[PDB]
Amino acid sequence: GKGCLIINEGWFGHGSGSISFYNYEKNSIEHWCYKNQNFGDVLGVTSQSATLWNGKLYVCSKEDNQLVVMDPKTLYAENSCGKLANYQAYEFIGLNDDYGIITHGGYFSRINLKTFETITLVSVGNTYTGTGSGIAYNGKLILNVNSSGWGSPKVYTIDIAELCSPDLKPTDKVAFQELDIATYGGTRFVQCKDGNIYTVETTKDGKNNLVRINADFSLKKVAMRDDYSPSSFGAYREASFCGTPEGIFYYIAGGKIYKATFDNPAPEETLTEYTKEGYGFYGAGIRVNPKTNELLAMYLTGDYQKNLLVRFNAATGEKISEIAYDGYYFPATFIFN
Ligand code: CNC
């Protein structure tokens, strides 16, 4: 069936995160989709992020069941990992066939994708401040470090081959370089068909730059809208910044959706002026499906009891559909398969 997955934080203090399914053909929402496919097994507490990697869906939770690896189509569990570490799991970042990264509120971990052995790296620069998103690119991990913490760490690059050493120990001072990309909050990484990476700098003074990272790791910057906000490391969520392989980017700025490019990074024109009265953005806020030309938007009310998903045309901004539903879900992000 045509649709999208919604990763839910879940109701902190009351139950787990969960996976909902917005069926577009039915214009219906189905809840607890992982649970109902896996004989009552559940995600952890605060399911914040998921990642597609080598045909599997990795779903992170901050606490308890910190990682579930599942089939993207069926949601049948490959591995329900339980607690990986004494650090909160934020995101999964793929390195290769053998290894991934788990980001945290302080440090980051290497995870073996066969065994689930989790090694937390405690002496890699100022990654003690927290790690957000990241991406594997041209033999390097590009890592969103919490620039708001002590020492103002900028984006790190780390050699994947060094990270993937079979002799890696938690105290190894794995070499890094800093890129000139301040990330005072959480950012995201988009790979385009040019073979470059796109991300969002947010500086100490709150200026937002769209940053192209080249295959050489040299930078080109252009100013985004000043009213763009990253996600806060105070309560880590995936940032709103996303985009297509064609170089069309989307972000939330001043509570409105913008379509942007590298040539038009700070648009005055919105994608849409859509509101529903008393619904505000939550979680990641937006994600684009490049395969369908669809932008999905997630909202809830001020008391968190009522939820809204809206599906737009990603080119023109016209509303295709919406669905309103009750419950303490706290939507985190969208996944398209
Ligand atoms: C609103 C909110 C929320 N909060 Co606060 C945020 N942002 N929060 C707040 C505020 C509560 C009061 C208010 N203004 O309504 C506010 C700003 C004070 C707060 C505070 C904090 N929050 C924090 C975080 C990280 C979190 N918060 C969430 C619970 C995050 C929530 C999201 C979620 N998925 O649950 C959240 C969006 C919704 C809570 C709610 O209204 N639920 C409905 C209500 C009917 O249920 P309830 O059981 O009575 O809710 C109570 C608890 O949620 C409690 N509480 C709230 N946050 C925390 C955090 C912890 C660690 C603990 C033990 C309790 C809480 O306060 C609520 C009383 O109204 C969280 C899941 C968000 C996220 N997705 O990461 C997350 C906890 C993750 C985890 N598994 O540990 C802070 C550490 C932020 C910071 N750096 O200061 C801090 C810790 C407070 C503490 N207890 O020590």
Tab-separated table of N, CA, C and O in Angstrom, residues 137-193:
chain	number	residue	atom	x	y	z
A	137	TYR	N	30.695	9.437	3.960
A	137	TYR	CA	30.946	10.078	2.678
A	137	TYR	C	32.430	10.041	2.347
A	137	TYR	O	33.200	10.523	3.159
A	138	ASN	N	32.786	9.506	1.163
A	138	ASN	CA	34.141	9.432	0.637
A	138	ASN	C	35.176	8.924	1.656
A	138	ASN	O	36.179	9.593	1.915
A	139	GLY	N	34.831	7.833	2.363
A	139	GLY	CA	35.716	7.224	3.356
A	139	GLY	C	35.758	7.900	4.731
A	139	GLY	O	36.564	7.426	5.551
A	140	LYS	N	34.928	8.935	5.002
A	140	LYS	CA	34.868	9.656	6.260
A	140	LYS	C	33.455	9.602	6.839
A	140	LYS	O	32.452	9.633	6.099
A	141	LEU	N	33.380	9.530	8.171
A	141	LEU	CA	32.185	9.883	8.927
A	141	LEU	C	32.210	11.400	9.051
A	141	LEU	O	33.199	11.903	9.614
A	142	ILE	N	31.132	12.077	8.624
A	142	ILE	CA	30.894	13.489	8.862
A	142	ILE	C	29.940	13.488	10.049
A	142	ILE	O	28.873	12.884	9.920
A	143	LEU	N	30.269	14.186	11.146
A	143	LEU	CA	29.581	14.056	12.427
A	143	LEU	C	29.140	15.430	12.939
A	143	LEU	O	29.965	16.307	13.155
A	144	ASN	N	27.836	15.571	13.217
A	144	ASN	CA	27.244	16.727	13.878
A	144	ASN	C	27.577	16.654	15.373
A	144	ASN	O	27.030	15.801	16.045
A	145	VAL	N	28.450	17.547	15.857
A	145	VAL	CA	28.853	17.618	17.256
A	145	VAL	C	28.113	18.822	17.851
A	145	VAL	O	27.803	19.760	17.142
A	146	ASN	N	27.841	18.784	19.153
A	146	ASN	CA	27.126	19.848	19.859
A	146	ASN	C	28.082	21.028	20.081
A	146	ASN	O	28.757	21.089	21.111
A	147	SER	N	28.012	22.011	19.166
A	147	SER	CA	28.793	23.242	19.261
A	147	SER	C	28.389	24.150	20.431
A	147	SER	O	29.174	25.035	20.760
A	148	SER	N	27.191	23.998	21.020
A	148	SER	CA	26.784	24.753	22.210
A	148	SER	C	27.525	24.329	23.491
A	148	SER	O	27.504	25.101	24.455
A	149	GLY	N	28.128	23.135	23.543
A	149	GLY	CA	28.879	22.651	24.696
A	149	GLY	C	30.296	23.223	24.765
A	149	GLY	O	30.710	24.043	23.923
A	150	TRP	N	31.023	22.796	25.813
A	150	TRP	CA	32.353	23.286	26.131
A	150	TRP	C	33.343	23.034	24.986
A	150	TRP	O	33.312	21.959	24.411
A	151	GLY	N	34.125	24.087	24.619
A	151	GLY	CA	35.053	24.056	23.507
A	151	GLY	C	34.442	24.288	22.117
A	151	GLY	O	35.227	24.302	21.179
A	152	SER	N	33.117	24.478	21.974
A	152	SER	CA	32.440	24.814	20.729
A	152	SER	C	32.827	23.907	19.564
A	152	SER	O	33.259	24.430	18.528
A	153	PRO	N	32.792	22.543	19.712
A	153	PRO	CA	33.239	21.654	18.643
A	153	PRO	C	32.402	21.819	17.379
A	153	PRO	O	31.175	21.811	17.476
A	154	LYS	N	33.087	21.986	16.232
A	154	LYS	CA	32.444	22.068	14.930
A	154	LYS	C	32.262	20.658	14.385
A	154	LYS	O	32.565	19.679	15.072
A	155	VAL	N	31.708	20.539	13.166
A	155	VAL	CA	31.510	19.239	12.516
A	155	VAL	C	32.858	18.513	12.430
A	155	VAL	O	33.845	19.134	12.059
A	156	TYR	N	32.877	17.225	12.831
A	156	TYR	CA	34.047	16.371	12.761
A	156	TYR	C	33.983	15.529	11.500
A	156	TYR	O	32.903	15.106	11.107
A	157	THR	N	35.175	15.270	10.920
A	157	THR	CA	35.388	14.191	9.972
A	157	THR	C	36.323	13.170	10.624
A	157	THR	O	37.333	13.552	11.219
A	158	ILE	N	35.985	11.888	10.509
A	158	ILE	CA	36.737	10.775	11.072
A	158	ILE	C	36.892	9.744	9.955
A	158	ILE	O	35.890	9.413	9.305
A	159	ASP	N	38.097	9.159	9.818
A	159	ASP	CA	38.363	8.114	8.846
A	159	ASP	C	37.579	6.845	9.220
A	159	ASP	O	37.663	6.391	10.372
A	160	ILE	N	36.787	6.300	8.270
A	160	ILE	CA	35.951	5.115	8.498
A	160	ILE	C	36.835	3.886	8.779
A	160	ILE	O	36.496	3.155	9.709
A	161	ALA	N	37.898	3.674	7.973
A	161	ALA	CA	38.809	2.534	8.146
A	161	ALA	C	39.428	2.497	9.559
A	161	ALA	O	39.394	1.430	10.192
A	162	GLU	N	39.844	3.661	10.092
A	162	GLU	CA	40.333	3.813	11.468
A	162	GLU	C	39.259	3.482	12.510
A	162	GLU	O	39.526	2.696	13.432
A	163	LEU	N	38.054	4.042	12.341
A	163	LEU	CA	36.902	3.725	13.180
A	163	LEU	C	36.551	2.238	13.195
A	163	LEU	O	36.190	1.751	14.272
A	164	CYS	N	36.653	1.568	12.031
A	164	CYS	CA	36.302	0.164	11.854
A	164	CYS	C	37.422	-0.817	12.199
A	164	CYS	O	37.194	-2.005	11.951
A	165	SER	N	38.556	-0.373	12.812
A	165	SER	CA	39.613	-1.252	13.287
A	165	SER	C	39.037	-2.348	14.195
A	165	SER	O	38.306	-2.002	15.137
A	166	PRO	N	39.293	-3.666	13.953
A	166	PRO	CA	38.859	-4.707	14.894
A	166	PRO	C	39.403	-4.608	16.327
A	166	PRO	O	38.743	-5.141	17.213
A	167	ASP	N	40.524	-3.887	16.541
A	167	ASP	CA	41.155	-3.664	17.833
A	167	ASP	C	40.659	-2.402	18.549
A	167	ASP	O	41.241	-2.110	19.601
A	168	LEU	N	39.603	-1.685	18.046
A	168	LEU	CA	39.099	-0.455	18.628
A	168	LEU	C	38.707	-0.684	20.090
A	168	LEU	O	37.990	-1.647	20.380
A	169	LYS	N	39.187	0.205	20.964
A	169	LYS	CA	38.860	0.241	22.379
A	169	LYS	C	38.200	1.586	22.691
A	169	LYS	O	38.521	2.586	22.016
A	170	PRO	N	37.337	1.674	23.742
A	170	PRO	CA	36.676	2.935	24.091
A	170	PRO	C	37.548	4.194	24.288
A	170	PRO	O	37.099	5.285	23.945
A	171	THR	N	38.779	4.000	24.805
A	171	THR	CA	39.734	5.073	25.103
A	171	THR	C	40.654	5.450	23.936
A	171	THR	O	41.465	6.365	24.140
A	172	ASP	N	40.553	4.827	22.737
A	172	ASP	CA	41.399	5.160	21.595
A	172	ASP	C	41.111	6.576	21.103
A	172	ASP	O	39.943	6.930	20.903
A	173	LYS	N	42.189	7.379	20.953
A	173	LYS	CA	42.130	8.773	20.539
A	173	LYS	C	42.129	8.724	19.018
A	173	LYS	O	43.145	8.995	18.374
A	174	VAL	N	40.961	8.359	18.451
A	174	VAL	CA	40.758	8.212	17.024
A	174	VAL	C	40.914	9.631	16.450
A	174	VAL	O	40.353	10.597	17.026
A	175	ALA	N	41.747	9.751	15.384
A	175	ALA	CA	42.031	11.023	14.745
A	175	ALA	C	40.740	11.628	14.165
A	175	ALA	O	39.861	10.892	13.745
A	176	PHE	N	40.581	12.947	14.289
A	176	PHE	CA	39.503	13.690	13.641
A	176	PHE	C	40.071	14.983	13.057
A	176	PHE	O	41.102	15.450	13.524
A	177	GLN	N	39.311	15.579	12.140
A	177	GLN	CA	39.500	16.949	11.684
A	177	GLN	C	38.198	17.683	11.925
A	177	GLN	O	37.148	17.046	11.927
A	178	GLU	N	38.276	18.994	12.172
A	178	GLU	CA	37.120	19.869	12.245
A	178	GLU	C	36.920	20.485	10.866
A	178	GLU	O	37.881	21.039	10.342
A	179	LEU	N	35.687	20.441	10.339
A	179	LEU	CA	35.262	21.340	9.264
A	179	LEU	C	34.832	22.668	9.884
A	179	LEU	O	34.316	22.671	11.003
A	180	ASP	N	34.845	23.757	9.091
A	180	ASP	CA	34.337	25.068	9.509
A	180	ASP	C	32.804	25.131	9.358
A	180	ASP	O	32.269	25.919	8.567
A	181	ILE	N	32.094	24.317	10.152
A	181	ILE	CA	30.653	24.177	10.200
A	181	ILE	C	30.315	24.114	11.697
A	181	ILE	O	30.405	23.035	12.292
A	182	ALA	N	29.907	25.253	12.278
A	182	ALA	CA	29.332	25.281	13.617
A	182	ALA	C	27.920	24.688	13.565
A	182	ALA	O	27.175	24.982	12.633
A	183	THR	N	27.575	23.815	14.518
A	183	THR	CA	26.231	23.263	14.647
A	183	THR	C	25.819	23.434	16.109
A	183	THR	O	25.921	22.472	16.881
A	184	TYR	N	25.307	24.639	16.450
A	184	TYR	CA	24.780	24.917	17.795
A	184	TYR	C	23.603	24.018	18.226
A	184	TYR	O	23.467	23.779	19.435
A	185	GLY	N	22.927	23.379	17.272
A	185	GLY	CA	21.931	22.362	17.464
A	185	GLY	C	22.092	21.210	16.494
A	185	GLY	O	23.152	21.030	15.877
A	186	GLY	N	21.053	20.370	16.431
A	186	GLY	CA	21.045	19.231	15.520
A	186	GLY	C	20.917	19.713	14.075
A	186	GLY	O	20.241	20.729	13.822
A	187	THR	N	21.661	19.073	13.168
A	187	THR	CA	21.561	19.301	11.735
A	187	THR	C	21.361	17.966	11.047
A	187	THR	O	21.299	16.919	11.697
A	188	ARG	N	21.147	18.038	9.726
A	188	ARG	CA	20.973	16.880	8.871
A	188	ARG	C	21.828	17.040	7.622
A	188	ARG	O	22.263	18.154	7.286
A	189	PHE	N	22.015	15.908	6.928
A	189	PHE	CA	22.948	15.769	5.810
A	189	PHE	C	22.172	15.214	4.623
A	189	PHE	O	21.479	14.221	4.814
A	190	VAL	N	22.252	15.884	3.450
A	190	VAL	CA	21.621	15.436	2.219
A	190	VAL	C	22.724	15.189	1.191
A	190	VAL	O	23.474	16.126	0.884
A	191	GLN	N	22.739	13.985	0.577
A	191	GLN	CA	23.603	13.680	-0.551
A	191	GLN	C	22.819	14.005	-1.832
A	191	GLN	O	21.661	13.587	-1.973
A	192	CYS	N	23.468	14.719	-2.763
A	192	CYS	CA	22.899	15.061	-4.064
A	192	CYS	C	23.644	14.325	-5.174
A	192	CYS	O	24.781	13.880	-4.970
A	193	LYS	N	23.008	14.302	-6.358
A	193	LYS	CA	23.518	13.651	-7.570
A	193	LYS	C	24.785	14.287	-8.144
A	193	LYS	O	25.434	13.650	-8.952
